[PDB]
Amino acid sequence: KLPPGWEKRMSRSSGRVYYFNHITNASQWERPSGGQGEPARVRCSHLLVKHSQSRRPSSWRQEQITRTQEEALELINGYIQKIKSGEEDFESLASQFSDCSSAKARGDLGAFSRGQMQKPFEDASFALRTGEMSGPVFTDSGIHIILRTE
Hints:
The protein is an alpha+beta fold and 150 residues long. The protein has three helices and seven strands; from the N terminus they run ββββααβαββ. The chain has helices spanning 69-85, 90-97, 119-127, and strands at 6-10, 17-21, 27-28, 42-49, 108-112, 137-139, 142-148. Strands 5-4-7-6 form a four-stranded antiparallel sheet, sandwiched between helices. One of its GO terms (cellular component) is glutamatergic synapse. It catalyses: [protein]-peptidylproline (omega=180) = [protein]-peptidylproline (omega=0).
């Protein structure tokens, strides 16, 4: 019925229905749809929040990342909320706050194929449709939000 990764769910806090993608971790109120497989290549932008357990706990933003994984997740969740509200833009936030050097390109990683990025990042990227944003994506590098642009 629904596209790859998507399932209908209900919140435990409130008895309210939503849709959740267990590959991208995206959540949304809208039904995600009203032999195709996945694309062979995608182009994505991303915002990385590193933490003390990142493979390399440093970035252009601070030579020493000291925040906990839980604190990085709180930041990621806050950025997602600001983007969904319309108060901030994805690329703008990536340029200012991403811990990946890709911030210099406003978060653009360019086009890539499978086998080239860290596995959870790749899985989420190839499960997004064009224009869609992931939820928090956990990798050895830290926690990402991903926006598929092509």
